[PDB]
Design a protein around this ligand. Sequence first.
Ligand code: NA
Lengths: 117, 121
Amino acid sequence: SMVSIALLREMFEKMVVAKNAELIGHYYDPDFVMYSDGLRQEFAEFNEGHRKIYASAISYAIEYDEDAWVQAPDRVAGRVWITTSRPGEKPTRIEVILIAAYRDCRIHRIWETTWPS
Amino acid sequence: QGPGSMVSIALLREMFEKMVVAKNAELIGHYYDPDFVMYSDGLRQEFAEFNEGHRKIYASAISYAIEYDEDAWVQAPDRVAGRVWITTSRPGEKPTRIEVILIAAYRDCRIHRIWETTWPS
Ligand code: NA
């Protein structure tokens, strides 16, 4: 496989599912910018926002549409379902189509849209 | 690998320009395979419905404009991902701008699958 897809999947497992905010600076470049559903967020705000939510009672599960992966040098696109659970609530499933571009094996840009928003 | 396997960005752009912006329904079967399926914001649509629906809308007063995020492309053999904005206008209505992130898988230079999500929905 290509390096980018493997790193993206590792980030989703070890950072997101594990809610490990100490790995944000491991997987994401200091100049990272996220574009998501009309919002633009640079590294510092992405980092602080994820530190706060990972400290909450939420939990995450992640799965992928294997048929949708696109992989190229320093780039990957995929179709991801993120299922979020909170104590006392029904889980909610969000579909994300995302493009990730890497610099020196860290995520430098993500562009994503989600359904529902 | 055939020549078309490495030019999916160019093929997708040509489809947006000559099929969508030009509203040319005769090119639907040229750019899309008969077993094409679209997934868009949770809806699945097959070729027959995609074709008939676009034949009807292209005969209407709608117009389309396309903007590309030229920094967001991913290109691999028989595959492309990108980020575009589609703005649609109708007489007497404010234009509507939709961001689309899409993945297209090709087979023999025709689109076989699209998976996309949009903002707003
Ligand atoms: Na074009």
